[PDB]
Design a protein around this ligand. Structure first.
Ligand SMILES: *C(=O)CCCC[C@@H]1SC[C@@H]2NC(=O)N[C@@H]21
Ligand SMILES: *C(=O)CCCC[C@@H]1SC[C@@H]2NC(=O)N[C@@H]21
Ligand SMILES: *C(=O)CCCC[C@@H]1SC[C@@H]2NC(=O)N[C@@H]21
Lengths: 541, 210, 541, 541
């Protein structure tokens, strides 16, 4: 039937209130700062290396992805802020690599493009981290993976941090070997010069493409040949495109220039015989009834004041409709059913500290979402986990452990978004990074640490007051201020969205408004895989 | 001034609503895998008994209850107050407009049927009648408690005041987290139980409405 | 192609023949009696209890199901005649409970509503029987189950017949625990007061709904608290809706009144993520070419005269088309292929006593229907199984055993309809009640016993004549009449449709004409489950 | 390693205490009464019918089972007390049928023997109940089933209670048809005369045996032939063993007399190609360190006094060793790990009313036993479920519902033993009859009702005092005594072990001492089936 009317969420905020004006101004300042930083990261290695990249007839890497995907298609870039002030004097825009999800010939493909304008396309340790993150996104979601190989050797003085470990560079080839055994098609397009470790990236591909007078593959370079043998050889005579397409047989297609290689890539993807099948149910899409500059005004920059998380769920779902589950029992957690772009979503959000009733409500809701095969969207705004003697007497530990067990055993596509603070073990309960969500984005006001700066400063102040009163010396106000400034300063600097997103702890600082669109894009890629049956472990009753 | 609707006009409004619900059922079926199946026909066919639907239509200011019996042959028997009408009809389209074709006690008529949110519009050659569908309480409803155990910074209102819904009543800080209470309810405050600077506990009533 | 023309069944009966007039009049009398009896059962517990039910703001239970299902949807009630003269002075309409299949939010749901107007909604043993029948209908057909809980405690002086056995009251909670492990969603709506055993029916639900100032859940009542403790407590202070939604956490949604609870129920069903998938093939539906007041005239009330079962199959299938399988070999069984409402049906019907050729034809047809995954509709009009010395010499026992083995091993959705007599072990061969059909309806002329009244009377007359002639006393005509009246009287009373349907031996006396529509509704619910592969045992050759 | 020493349970009771002497004397009186009642039930239909059974060269049915099983093998009879005072003037020993588990040719087989000395071997409704219970025991445990057919027709004036329903007589043939599709071998031995409904029991067998001049199969008797046709035929000329082995082909082996038929049965079982495979782990067996006449002294006859359930677990397990799980949290439920005869058992027992902590401990333990594939033994000694306003405020309902859900979803072989009272919904939580245990035995002091006699009498006294004080009349002590005597009398009579075991609500009143041996035998049969993986539903957190 699906025809009767249903009430909807949402409250029109007081746009004249000075709290709204201050929250709106401060969040707008954060978003403008984000805008200008990503416009500086977009240029890449600078105009000198861009001139030397276009003087060899090479398309710039963002132009390569622009000519590769379907015309007019949205591209979802992942981890645009990697390597941001991560090395001391070495400015590495984008990590050196451009990874994202796009629509190629009607198929959602995962694209990995070596930016050669930034330090010769050399692999930094954060470049390997970003690449392995992209490859497990492609394996979780069953996305066909496209590599646009333009390398410059692994970096030498960071070689330890790139070479031997489990999640170091060689894992890349593991990821291409396993994904080929699962029918997830791997295409490599040699547009540059992979050398001596990176030459396995074209050689382990199910179907390969190379470019004449521009693309070289060899396991050993002309310096290594001139040192070990003494035979002078060039690059194109040693591992050029004519040699590889005609004699050795490493490359499978041959391309005149860059546009021909991207055209051939689209042909190879079109002949993959892939047909998308959704097992979830879809309703005709709709729109939120409230705009998202109101999310600028509602949420704001200060983490001291709380807000209602329902005013976020009114702004991001279809029709602003939301079936709230167990609405009065433990209202520091808001769990309900909504739809984004037709997809059914089970939305879990925070409203305060987590009592035991909140953890029981969360465990029940995650079990419902895994029994009905509904995806889960977690929204994190956490302060902590409700300290007190009575609550530890009640067994607040086993209830948080039940929520952690049900979140970790869940097989549905989970997506985390950190709309505020994310501190401590509550971060584990609300499906943080270590619990394998599909995607994890953050907002530019978020903070993430092991505790807040004030919590660390105040428990260290009380503990040192306790041990000095056992000692006997005078612990004054100035000693307390000299005790409290570096703890607050360190937890503020290292809790930033830019500190967390300089690594690949999160998949990217996103704008609040774009939040709605971004979630839809994320969920679309996550529905490219069939949904497995969830089986939980032992619930500690 | 507005004139009251005739019982025949209420029959037409009730029939248009029933057929609109059928239309929604039919367009759901067109998207179903289980096509041609029973349950898709909004016939109201109970086993061994008849089905009577009791609906209420609001005619201006006054409510009228219409008992609609579903007959085996697709007709309806609508009893309004005491009088039973034999009501038949269907929908048809001409261009972009939907028309309701009626036959009530052998009297045929035709009117344009437009249903916009709550109001049923019937446009005929003798006039235009607006019949409203009543809205149930649970779709039109949309005191306060303390969120945690904290100390109150600023009170706002006293007795004799009046706030409207979505108003600041109190601000309380609980383990360094500023909580501004708001009003889902409405009216006038009769007593504020906690003055500013006192300690309120979990799920303790703050203000009251008499 | 599907375009060429095909001959059809059906003969226009002699409407002027006095046999037709008498058969039509007697079947019309049976159907009018059925009509007035079900209109008395529909009112329920009477006007006094209906006034005291509406004085508390409660919707009456038939109004609850009318406001719960989709608008205009047909409701299929099951077992309307339970408890009909089953207890001595206790009149229990409908068993005390209203079970059926309806269409809620586009999903075929199974609805179980406690009628509180009949003896406080207390559980009689027939109420437990009717409820467990409804729950296995929901488990066979994978129908989501909705309970409308309004109980009054299990009945005390019948407590043995309600409490301990396997298919007594506690089995209900077993059925909700198993069905929740299979993703068959269980919703309970507490509209009344479940008490101390029935409080597990809301507590074991996957998603719960409760009503303020009207719905109470407790494992112990205020009499039990006042006896065991001595603390006076009310119902709402002990187990009310505010206490359960806010402190204890048993209820998941909270409802203002009855209409809000049914609205919330429709929301909960809409967000179940269920999409119906048919594995059978569908053709565009059609109509029979002959009306069913002709079935009144054809079939009639006397079981002595035979009729043709093909004149029934002309009246209930689409287009009156019927591909008859093996039409001459053993024509006391009529097996063929037809379609009802688009669904493909394999129709098995009787025409007389069952010879061995009839059993072989039946075994072959059931094997065809299970190899092609076609449903089966059995029509029972049985006298017996062809006595004789020659037929026992032929092995008529092993042929009936082959039909029983193939009927019992069959995995397709089987539906039985008893259009006439159903006596003895032929009732086992033609898929009676003990062989688990999906639904089993009867017509108001049917009889069902272990043998006919005349068979029992005549074999007992001949056996007692045989033992008296060995004895020597005079066994006259009057001794034979005093021997033959109570056997005939008992087998006539206890073979009735009302005696069989006062228990839950059948799912309901249906009108002949409504037969067509009812079968379509039944088959629709039975196609909500995927069809399993049939594997038979050992065929006794 | 398995070598280090471990503490053990058990306390030597005060054998000189007068409580021990009185408890021992009263339990010894109960066991002696049980002994003399089963020695009267063992004789069967009496000496006149036993003389007329042995005058036709027939072995008596207990002698048939004695010559069928392996020499010296223990036979586990099930439901020896069926039909005990269940019909008014009709004394039906054993129900008319002898069902049990025995060891035939090394295989645990399930044996069903028609006692023909009791009313001609005719089927009473309790005979059908006992037979269908035996057949689902054979299907749960995968035991090959042997029938020793000696029937006399279904009983006529009880024909309704035998014929049409789902779990009436025809279900028997359903059970043989399904079990043959699963490779559970069905042997029928026609030693008597099955007639006209019972003739399907030999005809649906995978391998059949018949006896000359003694065994007749026909779908129609000589009275029915003489009535319908008028042809006089005998029994042996119509359906004898020579006719069936030579012309018709219903029987597969031919036997001279009864000893030859049992010898041929043992041959047929030996050539079944069955090899028992245990998936559990076995340790070398041991003995309890305390005898079980101490269980007579410990447990006794009065249900008012409590005892320790651990003194039962010291008396029935191997070595008196018992790893107690969660021993302090909620000590009104005792859950632990032990071994009986080498088999690993998870033992759950009661010690009082069930608080919410007891239900949480029970749910955790059942989840451990299903994760490790360990069987479960439930010991029931229940008064109730802890009434009070605070406990209903805590949500005691959802905790009992969690225990009921985990008990009902469990796939391990569960065995219930009712060592004391078993009242109300706690009976559902501790795996009573409706939750499908493998076997359910009781002790001769047990009581089972919907509540105790005193609970029913006292809550009815307080409720009628409430309503009279609203009325105004005088409710004195004598009115209260006339109110309290029939409630106590009815709940005492219908709560008996003999009232519960006259039906097939339990598998038999067993001696306390024999309890140990009986459990081992039960568990051995229950390990003839491989253990399935358990998947629970939704745990109401
Ligand atoms: C003040 O400086 C902060 C003290 C502790 C932080 C608070 S207490 C309650 C919240 N839960 C938690 O673990 N930390 C938060
Ligand atoms: C006359 O009173 C009836 C005699 C037997 C009934 C007939 S004989 C053939 C049919 N088969 C059967 O078992 N009973 C029917
Ligand atoms: C006295 O006559 C008995 C009163 C109630 C019985 C007791 S109260 C606590 C136990 N739990 C329960 O439900 N019944 C038992």
């Amino acid at each position: 039937y699906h025809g009767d009317s249903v009430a909807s969420l949402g409250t029109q905020p007081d746009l004249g209130s000075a709290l709204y004006q201050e929250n709106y101004k401060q969040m707008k300042a954060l978003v403008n700062q984000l805008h200008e930083r990503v416009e500086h990261i977009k240029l890449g290695g600078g105009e000198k290396a861009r001139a030397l990249h276009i003087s060899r007839g090479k398309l710039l890497p963002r132009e390569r992805i622009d000519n590769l995907i379907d015309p007019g298609s949205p591209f979802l870039e992942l981890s645009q802020f990697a390597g941001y002030q991560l090395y001391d004097n070495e400015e590495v825009p984008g990590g050196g690599i451009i990874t994202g999800i796009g629509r190629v010939s009607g198929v959602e493909c995962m694209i990995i493009a070596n930016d050669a304008t930034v330090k010769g396309g050399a692999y930094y340790p954060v470049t390997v981290k970003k690449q392995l993150r992209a490859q497990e996104i492609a394996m979780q979601n069953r996305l066909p993976c496209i590599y646009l190989v333009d390398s410059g050797g692994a970096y030498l003085p960071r070689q330890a941090d790139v070479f031997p470990d489990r999640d170091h560079f060689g894992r890349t080839f593991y990821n291409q070997a396993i994904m080929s055994s699962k029918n997830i098609a791997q295409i490599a397009v040699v547009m540059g010069s992979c050398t001596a470790g990176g030459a396995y990236v074209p050689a382990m591909a199910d179907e390969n493409i190379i470019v004449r007078k521009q693309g070289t593959i060899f396991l050993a370079g002309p310096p290594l040949v001139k040192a070990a043998t003494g035979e002078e050889v060039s690059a194109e005579d040693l591992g050029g495109a004519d040699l590889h397409c005609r004699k050795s047989g490493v490359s499978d297609h041959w391309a005149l220039d860059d546009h021909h290689a991207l055209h051939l890539t689209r042909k190879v993807v079109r002949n993959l015989n892939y047909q998308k099948k959704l097992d979830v149910t879809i309703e005709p899409s709709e729109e939120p009834l409230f705009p998202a500059d109101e999310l600028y005004g509602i949420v704001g920059a200060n983490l001291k004041r709380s807000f209602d998380v329902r005013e976020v769920i009114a702004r991001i779902v279809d029709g602003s409709r939301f079936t709230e589950f167990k609405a009065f029992y433990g209202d520091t957690l808001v769990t309900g059913f909504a739809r984004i772009f037709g997809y059914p979503v089970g939305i879990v959000g925070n409203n305060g500290v987590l009592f035991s009733e909140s953890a029981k409500k969360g465990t029940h809701f995650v079990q419902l979402c895994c029994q009905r095969n509904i995806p889960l969207l977690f929204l994190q705004n956490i302060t902590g986990f409700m300290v007190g003697r009575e609550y530890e007497a009640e067994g607040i530990a086993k209830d948080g452990a039940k929520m952690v067990a049900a979140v970790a055993c869940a097989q549905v596509p989970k997506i985390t978004l950190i709309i505020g603070g994310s501190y401590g073990a509550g971060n584990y309960g609300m499906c943080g990074r270590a619990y394998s969500p599909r995607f994890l984005y953050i907002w530019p006001n978020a903070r993430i640490s092991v505790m807040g700066g004030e919590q660390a400063a105040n428990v260290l102040a009380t503990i040192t007051k306790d041990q000095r009163a056992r000692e006997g010396k005078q612990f004054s106000s100035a000693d307390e201020a000299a005790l409290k400034e570096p703890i607050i300063k360190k937890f503020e600097e290292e809790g930033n969205p830019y500190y967390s997103s300089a690594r690949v702890w999160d998949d990217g600082i996103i704008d609040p408004a774009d939040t709605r669109l971004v979630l839809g894009l994320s969920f679309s890629a996550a529905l490219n895989a069939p949904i497995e049956k969830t089986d939980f472990g032992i619930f500690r009753m | 001034s507005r004139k009251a609707a005739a019982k025949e006009s209420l029959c037409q409004a009730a029939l248009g609503l029933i057929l609109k619900e059928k239309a929604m059922t039919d367009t759901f079926t067109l998207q179903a895998h289980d096509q041609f199946s029973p349950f898709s026909s909004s016939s109201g066919r109970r086993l061994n008994i008849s089905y009577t639907r009791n609906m209420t239509l609001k005619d201006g200011k006054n409510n009228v209850a219409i008992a609609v019996t579903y007959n085996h042959d697709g007709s309806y028997s609508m009893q309004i107050e005491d009088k039973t009408f034999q009501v038949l009809g269907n929908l048809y389209s001409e261009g972009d407009c939907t028309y309701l074709k009626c036959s009530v006690n052998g009297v045929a008529s035709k009117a344009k049927l437009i249903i916009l949110e709550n109001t049923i519009y019937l446009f005929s050659k003798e006039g235009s009648i607006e019949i409203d569908i009543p809205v149930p309480k649970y779709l039109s409803s949309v005191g306060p408690l303390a969120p945690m155990t904290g100390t109150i910074e600023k009170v706002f209102v006293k007795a004799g005041d009046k706030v409207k819904a979505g108003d600041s009543l109190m601000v309380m800080i609980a383990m360094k987290m500023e909580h501004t209470i708001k009003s889902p309810k409405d009216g006038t405050v009769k007593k504020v139980f906690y003055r500013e600077g006192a300690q309120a506990n979990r799920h303790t009533p703050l203000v009251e409405f008499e």
